Design a protein around this ligand. Structure first.
Ligand SMILES: Cc1ccc(CC2CCN(c3c(NS(=O)(=O)c4c(C)noc4C)c(=O)c3=O)CC2)cc1
Ligand SMILES: [Mg+2]
Ligand SMILES: [Mg+2]
Ligand SMILES: [Zn+2]
Ligand SMILES: [Zn+2]
Lengths: 1163, 468
């Protein structure tokens, strides 16, 4: 079988140097003239940068001269002026060339940070450049004489040198010389000579530098490249259309800057071809050459020189390199999109959560071609041109059509910062009059949408795959659980929770007090008709269920003691739940957990429609309630002014003491600030005691008091809005503010918002406010950088294998942060899968048998016993190379089951972590980066480098050496510690490797090195979570672990047999290859390694795909460094596959990539 | 510091300025140089007869007088006689080779030296000379390699009987019998060296000169040639500074500084070619013309992305001037039809002129916000044909196809024929008539009824909708 020739479908991509002969391969004619277009007949001048002869016809399937204009003639190259007649398209495809007179240095390989032509010859830059500007001569193949092969001579020196040995020694200068040097260089030869030198002379200064070169050369050998190539004979020209000369209005033209450049190269090149035939003196033809060497470089990468400015325009012209770069990092906004639109969003409580409110006017335009299609499908339109006219006419017929084409056809809604995957969600469209989008209220949470005028965009899933993807993955209803922490993200929001709370809440005595009812049905009949108060204490008959059988529903009836409200509500609740869940007061918390359990017990569908019922209902009764807010709602404690004057007298006290010198000045500042900070806590807990319960009401007897029904309390107690924090600024005094300084002011704002603030008090209120806005604006820019860092280090990571079959894992315990249980065990371990079976307190008792996915029942069977710590599989431990086995991950999803093969978790990990990032304030958000960046701390601790007994030797030469002494082993470890930092180590005591040998923070690096992979991995996860969880943010460890996994992708070698000894490389490759010697060729040996902690920013920097690399790293450098080596990208990763516009190798594409990936390296 | 002005500035900063006299030192050496070859060319037999053969082409009408000579030392009539004089001295010198010929071959060249040739032709001769020396050098090297490298013979004794001859067999077959270590060796290649000796002694026939003389001439010429360039080069180098002083004037005109001085440096190279010190005109002020010529001739030429004719450029300059007298003169600025009057020409051409006179614009011109929206980002593609349209087209085909099949097979062939429909070209109605054998007015009727048919509905309904 013959492989192929023409256009098949590629995988992989190669980059390399181009031959002059190769560059000629591409051209369809040498551009010979700086002419563009004619100036009157704006036709293109042959043969100059824009040409038909060389590139293509200016108009479709039409000869230039016009002889042949008929579409029948295609492969015809017209006789007058050489023009094959084809699409004008080819003027965007066909390249051209220029032959250079004298050789020319390619600015990339000359000036890309570490000069390639430089270090390839092992020749300094300032020398090579000198040879180029004709400042000095350099020998080449210096022969048996006096002179080194790469030695440089001066005018006068070269002269004299010549008098001696005429021939048999050779010197040149300028590009031709370098080109000479490179040509002659034998890489194969230099490879053998450099190998001798390595083994002969033993030096770290000598054989360290020695090794790095010889690996680089045989790279270049094996590359495919030839060194000469870096010096240009032939220069390709970009198809015109990409540097077009198009006309504008009022008749002026506009053009790409390349033309200024290109023209200049062409010109100077020509004027030089000229100078050679005029036999001009060397001083000029030299000068010219230099100008050509420049004019090229301004063309290729302007800026590695003086930066030629564009014509008449001060601004410098865009060179090819600056054409590639695009946009700190990079950023890369790009790709506008058809079938898309947007407008302001509004509410729609009437929506089912699986849909959304889309304007007639939008939908008409969006689905337009679809309509054209359904229109002439049924025959209402004779033809498409009619359909166009029909919908243009907005004929009434169409709307009945549009509803068809609309129906089962999801659309995508996406809002501004797309942060977690829930930033895009798919809904089923419901037609709307108005130019607003109607967005279901429960989703508004995920979107971080307010309705203060936020706008969202829409997108039509065109292709069938896209519809089904939108329906089975991106649909609203599939994401009701957060992927960051499996708690419901689709929890009732604010209006709706006040509603359920006010509904399921009770007062002391009201209509209906104490009667008894058949069931909720007549509870509502009771209320609607004004007989009972919504909240009145009542015994009613209710029927709960519990499916506690083996997947089977048990029914139970009882006279539960409840309220009219909670009764009514039981009408919503599905089947297998307890009446207990609705019997409380139902705050925003309880109301969410409710939802959660519903999911975890009855499955998806039932939660979905449950959640809907809750909104509708919550809204409904929210409405009935007539809750409101007036001035009188915000009640000042009657004691306030008193409290102030008391704490106010206290300052007058600490003053008397200061004026009297009893107390010092600074002493006093912190003292006063405390008594105020204190008074404030008094006034705080004052109003709240009054506010909270002081609705006092009477039942039959005398008196009783209960939690308030005051408008404003209900808001906070429920959790609908407000926090005791904010409240405290309404009624009680508002805080102490601090000046721009950071120095918190010693006379707090004693007045509140219900009162006025005065002139000074407001003005002080200003700073914190202004810093407030400012700060959060930046902690925006910071979160954003972070999340990008993370995806950049993660991304390509996907669930690949099913079970990597490791018994290995990390040990999960509750956090116990000094006090009590800052985080529980049930939380850490839920949804994770067990390393090894867990036993009771007594044993031979397998409660959970090795790896069982620890779901909710299980966590309770665990919690039933006192189970105190569980080992769990974590991504960081997973034996799988190049991915993550489903088992070691966990289950998590917005779906509750275990993670499926192919889900692209690195991303969602990144996302999940960085999204909430906005809410952070050592400590704070930067404190996170510091961790993920693996940044070593300023003033570190140091650890026992090895176990055994220690002692001090030598003395105070800036460092008093510490000498550790092992029991069995060799003694030789002595590290020299600064004696001007306080020790903790006991000087005659034995120390475990990884003990505290001074105090202070430690670098994660030590923890890794000295204490272990699981140690550091635990260091990171807990210390970072220390930050987020202080802030009330929930992120399942799974995520932090995937990042940690990526942090230690790399390792360094220590044994021998097949690899490079000192090299840093991916453990993946080792793990595979020491396994590829352990039963393979020779033991050889080997090799032992060392896991290395990389900061994410540094890890990410190493990536196999060079295309991926040009995305985020610096593009010029990436390409050069990669191009010389003749490097092949085989895609495989995500970024790059998008870049190149093919199926993502994860998710749906995973299936495809796999099926193809095997067809490769096959038969 | 890289920037090629610097390394140029310095490299020519070395070359020292000429004395008032030093201009003549070099001026003289040039004349010597040329004159040397002018005399070296005169001495060539084929160079004479060629100018003869070439003039016989000019009176028989196969060339022109402007194409051969550039005038002499001193009219079509005058030329005819000067040529007889030349033809005359040739025919005498020709038959005289019986010695005293020397006295006359010296004169033949004299008349020949009066002739100022077209530079093109001048070189051709020079060319035909060195080409013939290459042919001599070809046969000289074939005889040496076939002897020294192949048949193992010393070049030390190879050159002993060679000098004075290298044509006859006094070296080839008579020095093989000297019974030297290299003597009996020379017989194996005897067929290859003596058979190629055809072109070598034949050159003494074409050129009419022994291999002896042939080398001497264009050798003394080569030296003269080198001699001259050497001095001219030198002359140029002296004045590079001058170019710069001039070029500093024309800077922002749309061409790089160094772009100027290199074109101006070419003006200097020119002026050095056409100059004669014998006119007492200082090389200084005579050179400033040729440079300032080439600067401008270049500028006007190539500093535009859209190149415009020279008059056009000059037409423009006048215009910026006229608005100057009249800018402040008219309180504001003169109307578009005002300068129109000042100018000599149609005066509406002002609009026409003024429009092509604009330079194109950087597509990568930043537009508002300074933001990365750039001009080119707004330039829409007009060559494209949008999909509602590509759609209707895939469709018009469909309709015309169906509408014509629902017709009569002859009315289809008749219609597909009159129009370009799924056929190359369309056919003249007569062209159509002959194709069916039943013709003329007839086919035109078949046609009209077919249209007539497709005209009302059942049929009409669909096609109509394509009309907007
Ligand atoms: C050989 C080689 C490879 C890569 C580079 C760097 C270029 C790549 C293309 N590039 C951009 C997009 N590519 S994309 O597929 O459209 C896209 C989107 C959208 N989001 O992520 C991706 C990737 C932009 O958008 C955008 O801007 C500019 C920088 C240079 C040389
Ligand atoms: Mg909101
Ligand atoms: Mg807003
Ligand atoms: Zn043509
Ligand atoms: Zn695993």
């Amino acid at each position: 079988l013959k492989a192929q020739t023409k256009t098949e479908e590629f995988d992989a991509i190669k980059i390399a140097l181009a031959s002059p002969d190769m560059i000629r391969s591409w051209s369809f004619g040498e551009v010979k003239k700086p002419e563009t277009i004619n100036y009157r007949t704006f036709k293109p001048e042959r043969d100059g940068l824009f040409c038909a002869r060389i590139f293509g016809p200016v108009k479709d399937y039409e000869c230039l001269c016009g002889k042949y204009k008929r579409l029948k003639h295609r492969g015809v190259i017209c006789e007058k002026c050489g023009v094959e007649v084809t699409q004008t398209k080819v003027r965007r495809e066909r390249m051209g060339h220029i032959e250079l007179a004298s050789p020319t240095a390619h600015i990339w390989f000359l000036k890309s940070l570490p000069s390639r032509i430089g270090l390839l010859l092992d020749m300094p830059l300032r020398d090579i450049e000198r040879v180029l500007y004709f400042e000095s001569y350099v020998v080449i193949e210096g022969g048996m004489t006096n002179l080194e092969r790469q030695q440089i001579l001066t005018e006068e020196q070269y002269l004299d040198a010549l008098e001696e040995f005429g021939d048999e020694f050779d010197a040149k200068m300028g590009a031709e010389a370098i080109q000479a040097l490179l040509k002659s260089m034998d890489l194969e030869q230099e490879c053998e000579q450099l190998r001798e030198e390595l083994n002969e002379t033993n030096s770290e200064t000598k054989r360290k530098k020695l090794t790095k070169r010889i690996k680089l050369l045989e790279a270049f050998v094996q590359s495919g490249n030839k060194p000469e190539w870096m010096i240009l004979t032939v220069l390709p020209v970009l198809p015109p259309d990409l540097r077009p000369l198009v006309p504008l209005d009022g008749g002026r033209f506009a053009t790409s800057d390349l033309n200024d450049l290109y023209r200049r190269v062409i010109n100077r090149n020509n004027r030089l071809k000229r100078l050679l035939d005029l036999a001009a003196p060397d001083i000029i033809v030299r000068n010219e050459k230099r100008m050509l060497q420049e004019a090229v470089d301004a063309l290729l990468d302007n800026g590695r020189r003086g930066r030629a400015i564009t014509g008449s325009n001060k601004r410098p012209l865009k060179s090819l390199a600056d054409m590639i770069k695009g946009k700190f990092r990079q950023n890369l906004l790009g790709k506008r999109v058809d079938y898309s639109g947007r407008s302001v969003i509004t509410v729609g409580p009437y929506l089912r959560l699986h849909q959304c409110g889309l304007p007639k006017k939008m939908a008409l335009e969006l689905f337009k071609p679809f309509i054209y299609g359904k229109l002439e499908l049924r025959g209402l339109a004779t033809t498409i041109k009619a359909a166009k006219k029909m919908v243009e006419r907005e004929e009434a017929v169409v709307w009945d059509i549009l509803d068809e084409v609309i129906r089962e056809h999801p659309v995508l809604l996406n809002r501004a910062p797309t942060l977690h995957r829930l930033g895009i969600q798919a809904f089923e469209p419901v037609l709307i009059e108005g130019k607003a989008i109607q967005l279901h209220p429960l989703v508004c949470a995920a979107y971080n949408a307010d309705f203060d005028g936020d706008q969202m965009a829409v997108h039509v899933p065109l292709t069938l795959e896209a519809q089904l993807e939108a329906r089975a993955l991106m649909m609203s209803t599939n994401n009701i659980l957060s992927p960051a922490n499996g708690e419901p993200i689709i929890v009732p929001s604010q209006d709706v929770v006040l509603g359920l709370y006010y509904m399921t809440r009770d007062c002391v005595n009201a209509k209906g007090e104490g009667m008894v009812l058949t069931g909720p049905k007549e509870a509502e009949r009771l209320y609607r008709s004004g007989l009972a108060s919504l909240h009145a204490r009542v015994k009613v008959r209710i029927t709960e269920y519990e499916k506690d059988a083996n997947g089977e529903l048990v029914a139970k009836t009882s006279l539960k003691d409840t309220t009219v409200g909670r009764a009514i509500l039981w009408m919503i609740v599905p089947k297998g739940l307890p009446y207990s869940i609705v019997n409380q007061a139902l705050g925003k918390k309880a109301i969410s957990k409710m939802l959660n359990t519903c999911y975890r017990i009855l499955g998806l569908k039932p939660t979905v429609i449950f959640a809907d019922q809750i909104m509708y209902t919550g809204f409904a009764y929210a409405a009935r309630s007539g809750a409101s807010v007036g001035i009188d709602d915000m009640v000042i404690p009657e004691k306030k002014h008193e409290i102030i004057s008391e704490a106010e007298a206290e300052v007058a006290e600490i003053q008397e003491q200061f004026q009297s010198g009893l107390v010092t000045a600074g002493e006093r500042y912190n003292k006063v600030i405390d008594i105020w900070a204190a008074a404030n806590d008094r006034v705080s807990k004052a109003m709240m005691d009054n506010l909270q319960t002081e609705t006092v009401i009477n039942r039959d007897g005398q008196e009783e008091k209960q939690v308030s029904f005051n408008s404003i309390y209900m808001m906070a107690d429920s959790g609908a809005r407000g926090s005791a924090a904010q409240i405290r600024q309404l009624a009680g005094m508002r805080g102490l503010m601090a000046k721009p300084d950071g120095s918190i002011i010693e006379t707090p704002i004693t007045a509140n918002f219900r009162e006025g603030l005065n002139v000074l008090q407001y003005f002080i209120s200003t700073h914190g406010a202004r810093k407030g806005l400012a700060d959060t604006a930046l902690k925006t820019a910071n979160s954003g950088y972070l999340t990008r860092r993370l995806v950049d280090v993660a991304q390509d990571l996907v669930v690949t294998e099913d079970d990597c079959g490791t018994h290995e894992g990390i040990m999960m315990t509750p956090v116990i942060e000094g006090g009590d249980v800052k985080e529980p065990l049930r939380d850490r371990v839920l949804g994770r899968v067990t390393a090894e079976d867990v036993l009771k307190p007594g044993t031979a008792d397998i409660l959970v048998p090795r790896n069982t996915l620890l779901h909710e029942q299980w966590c309770d069977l665990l919690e039933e016993n006192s189970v105190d710590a569980v080992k769990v599989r974590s991504v960081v431990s997973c034996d799988t190379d190049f991915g993550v086995c489903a088992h070691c991950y966990g289950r998590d999803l917005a779906r509750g089951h275990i993670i499926n093969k192919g889900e692209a978790i690195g991303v969602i990990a990144a996302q999940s972590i960085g999204e909430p990032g906005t809410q952070l304030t050592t400590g704070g958000l930067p404190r996170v980066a510091d961790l993920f960046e693996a940044r070593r701390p300023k003033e570190p601790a140091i650890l026992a480098e090895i176990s055994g007994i220690v002692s001090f030797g030598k003395e105070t030469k800036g460092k008093r050496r510490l000498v550790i002494t092992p029991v069995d082993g060799s003694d030789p470890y002595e590290e020299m510690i600064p004696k001007w930092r306080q020790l903790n180590v006991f000087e005659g005591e034995r120390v475990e490797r990884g003990d505290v040998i001074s105090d202070g923070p430690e670098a994660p690096h030590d923890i890794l090195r000295l204490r272990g992979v699981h140690a550091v991995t635990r260091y990171i996860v807990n210390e970072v979570q220390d930050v987020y969880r202080l802030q009330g943010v929930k992120i399942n460890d799974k995520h932090i672990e995937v990042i940690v996994r990526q942090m230690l992708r790399k390792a360094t070698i220590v044994n021998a047999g097949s690899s490079d000894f000192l090299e840093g490389e991916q453990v993946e490759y080792s793990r595979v290859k020491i396994a590829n010697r352990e039963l393979e060729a020779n033991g050889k040996v080997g090799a032992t390694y060392s896991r290395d902690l990389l900061g994410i920013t540094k890890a990410s920097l190493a990536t196999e795909s060079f295309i991926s690399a040009a995305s985020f790293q610096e593009t010029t450098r990436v390409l050069t460094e990669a191009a010389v080596a003749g490097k092949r990208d085989e895609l495989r990763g995500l970024k790059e596959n998008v870049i190149v516009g093919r199926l993502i190798p994860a998710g749906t594409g995973y299936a495809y990539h796999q099926d193809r990936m095997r067809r490769r390296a096959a038969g | 510091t890289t920037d090629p002005v610097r390394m140029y500035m310095r490299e020519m900063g070395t070359v020292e300025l000429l004395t008032r006299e030093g201009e003549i030192d070099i001026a003289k050496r040039i004349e010597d140089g040329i004159n040397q070859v002018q005399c070296s060319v005169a001495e060539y037999p084929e160079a004479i007869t060629y100018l003869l053969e070439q003039y016989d082409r000019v009176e028989a009408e196969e060339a022109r007088l402007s194409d051969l000579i550039t005038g002499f030392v001193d009219d079509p009539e005058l030329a005819r006689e000067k040529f007889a004089e030349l033809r005359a001295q040739y025919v005498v010198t020709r038959d005289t080779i019986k010695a005293t010929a020397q006295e006359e071959i010296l004169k033949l060249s004299e008349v020949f030296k009066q002739f100022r040739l077209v530079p093109k032709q001048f070189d051709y001769l020079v060319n035909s000379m060195r080409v013939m020396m290459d042919r001599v050098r070809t046969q000289e090297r074939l005889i040496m390699k076939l002897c020294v490298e192949q048949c193992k013979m010393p070049k030390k004794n190879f050159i002993t009987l060679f000098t004075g001859n290298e044509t006859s067999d006094t070296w080839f077959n008579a020095a093989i019998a000297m019974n030297k270590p290299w003597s009996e060796k020379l017989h194996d290649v005897s067929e290859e060296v003596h058979r190629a000796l055809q072109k070598l002694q034949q050159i003494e026939e074409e050129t009419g000169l022994t291999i002896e003389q042939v080398k001497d001439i264009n050798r003394r010429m080569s030296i003269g040639e080198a001699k001259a360039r050497r001095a001219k080069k030198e002359m140029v180098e002296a004045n590079l500074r001058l170019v710069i002083s001039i070029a500093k004037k024309y800077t922002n005109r749309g061409l790089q500084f160094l772009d100027l001085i290199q074109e101006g440096n070419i003006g200097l190279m020119k002026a050095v070619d056409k100059f004669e010190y014998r006119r007492g005109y200082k090389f200084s002020t005579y050179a400033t013309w040729w440079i300032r010529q080439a600067i401008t001739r270049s500028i006007a030429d190539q500093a535009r992305t859209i190149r415009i004719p020279v008059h056009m450029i000059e037409t423009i300059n006048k215009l910026n001037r006229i608005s100057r007298q009249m800018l402040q003169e008219m309180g504001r600025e003169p109307t578009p039809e005002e300068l129109a009057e000042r100018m000599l020409m149609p005066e509406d051409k002002i609009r026409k002129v003024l429009k092509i006179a604009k330079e194109p614009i950087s597509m990568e011109t930043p537009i508002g916000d300074d933001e990365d929206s750039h001009l080119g980002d707004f330039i829409e593609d007009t060559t494209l044909e949008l999909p509602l349209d590509s759609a209707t087209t895939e469709s018009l085909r469909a309709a015309t196809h169906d509408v014509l099949a629902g017709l009569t097979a002859r009315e289809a062939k008749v219609l597909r024929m009159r129009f370009g429909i799924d056929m190359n070209t369309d056919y003249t109605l007569e062209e159509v008539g002959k194709q069916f054998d039943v013709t003329r007015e007839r086919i035109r009727q078949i046609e009209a009824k077919a249209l007539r048919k497709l005209r009302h509905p059942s049929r009409s309904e669909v096609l109509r909708s394509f009309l907007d």
